[PDB]
Amino acid sequence: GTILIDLSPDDKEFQSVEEEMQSTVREHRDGGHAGGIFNRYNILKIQKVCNKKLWERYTHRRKEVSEENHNHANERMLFHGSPFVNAIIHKGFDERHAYIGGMFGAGIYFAENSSKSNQYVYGIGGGTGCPVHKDRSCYICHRQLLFCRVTLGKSFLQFSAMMAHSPPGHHSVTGRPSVNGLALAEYVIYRGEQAYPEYLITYQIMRPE
Ligand SMILES: Cc1cc(O)nc2ccccc12
Ligand SMILES: [Zn+2]
């Protein structure tokens, strides 16, 4: 069902996606433990993910959420990092993509910081790093992130000192760091139909000079 369309680096669409990747790197309080040490990426490819069935599933749910929230989907573009990126683009988000041990409950997590999503590319806490070199900071192996369209509807705001169901009458959770003033928010959804994996970004983290 899914096809992947390569975007040309000359297309404005590739350019705005790359910009959202690069401009939302930040430093991490683990010193690079999970995701590696870097200030920027080498973007290698950006693909558009196309799946008629998955799209209609997303927009069906989006209209429902919109209806329960003063006609407002509260739709965002947010990063998602996971070892299951290949299953998500073909079969969609579902409960196996949920993070049972997560702070904001057992749901599917997205990040405004591309570098926060990068910490999950090889597993929770970076797992054991890349498959080939077991290196969480690997500068050689190609990584992949999704940049997804996410319906948040009415989002329960949970301040943070950094499959379950949304709090009653909410459609998602906003996990908002309240200590690190430069950390952007994370969002958790509890229905896989509330995210559509729009872009597939292949990249390397770059060793700082
Ligand atoms: C916080 C977070 C961001 C992300 O992009 N992926 C995750 C995948 C699993 C668990 C958490 C995650
Ligand atoms: Zn490697």
UniProtKB/Swiss-Prot annotation:
Where it sits in the cell: the answer is: Cytoplasm; Golgi apparatus membrane; Nucleus; Chromosome, Telomere
What this chain does, per the entry, is described as: Poly-ADP-ribosyltransferase involved in various processes such as Wnt signaling pathway, telomere length and vesicle trafficking. Acts as an activator of the Wnt signaling pathway by mediating poly-ADP-ribosylation of AXIN1 and AXIN2, 2 key components of the beta-catenin destruction complex: poly-ADP-ribosylated target proteins are recognized by RNF146, which mediates their ubiquitination and subsequent degradation. Also mediates poly-ADP-ribosylation of BLZF1 and CASC3, followed by recruitment of RNF146 and subsequent ubiquitination.
Which residues of the complete protein appear here? Answer: 952 to 1161 of 1166
- Please name the source species: Homo sapiens (Human)
Q: How does it assemble?
A: Oligomerizes and associates with TNKS. Interacts with the cytoplasmic domain of LNPEP/Otase in SLC2A4/GLUT4-vesicles. Binds to the N-terminus of Grb14 and TRF1 with its ankyrin repeat region. Interacts with HIF1AN. Interacts with RNF146; this interaction leads to ubiquitination and proteasomal degradation. Interacts with NUMA1.
Which gene name belongs to this protein? TNKS2
Ranked from the top, the taxonomy reads: Eukaryota, Metazoa, Chordata, Craniata, Vertebrata
Q: Can you give the residue ranges of the PARP catalytic domain? A: 8-209
Q: Family, per the entry?
A: Belongs to the ARTD/PARP family.
Q: How is it modified after translation?
A: Ubiquitinated at 'Lys-48' and 'Lys-63' by RNF146 when auto-poly-ADP-ribosylated; this leads to degradation. Deubiquitinated by USP25; leading to stabilization.
The name under which this protein is listed is Poly [ADP-ribose] polymerase tankyrase-2
